[PDB]
Design a binder for this molecule. Sequence first.
Ligand SMILES: *[C@@H]1O[C@H](CO)[C@@H](O)[C@H](O)[C@H]1NC(C)=O
Ligand SMILES: [Cu+2]
Length: 227
Amino acid sequence: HGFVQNIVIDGKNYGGYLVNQYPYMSNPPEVIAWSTTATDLGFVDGTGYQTPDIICHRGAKPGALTAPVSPGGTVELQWTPWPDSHHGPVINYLAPCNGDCSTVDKTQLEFFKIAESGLINDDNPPGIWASDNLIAANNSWTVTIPTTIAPGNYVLRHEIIALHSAQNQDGAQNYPQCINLQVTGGGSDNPAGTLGTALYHDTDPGILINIYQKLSSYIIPGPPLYT
Ligand SMILES: *[C@@H]1O[C@H](CO)[C@@H](O)[C@H](O)[C@H]1NC(C)=O
Ligand SMILES: [Cu+2]
């Protein structure tokens, strides 16, 4: 259980959507982060993969603000302290807003994968995952925005999937966090985009999986990485 508390871009903090404060507030602040109803700090499991909840988490609505990112610049997302138990991949997708991200229909966003990290080492099952990398980096993930994509406004959909219960149907725990970015530079790729509700299915080999046994490979779920 956890959520993105803060985002660092070009030497300043953009406060995140504090899901344990703002939902109780009724005049909460404008942020670059999407609002959610996930006040349990919980997940979207396999029962929700073909519901709108999977896109930017349960009941999610666009953030009011959009953060400019320098060309090929870094977006550092800072989580609440991530449990060692919650082993699994950290995956990053962009969808174009074709306009102000604050007014987009989330149901029509088309995501391309810009980064994935999965099973790093399996010497000691369940092993060392991207989630363990995120913990070792004091609960922060660094995303580099490609230079080869068309500039414009994009939703960054940032996700940990926890696999600690994933040996059972609908056991995998998706933690998607969305923020609004204004990508800059000279690129011109418009990568083939996957609907939120076509990202994952509940029987994918990276999703329905027993992590506690020796694993020879791990197929990171979601569409193919763009390069
Ligand atoms: C995280 O930072 C704290 C100090 O702020 C430190 O005590 C902790 O051990 C750090 N890093 C890692 C890899 O644990
Ligand atoms: Cu949890």
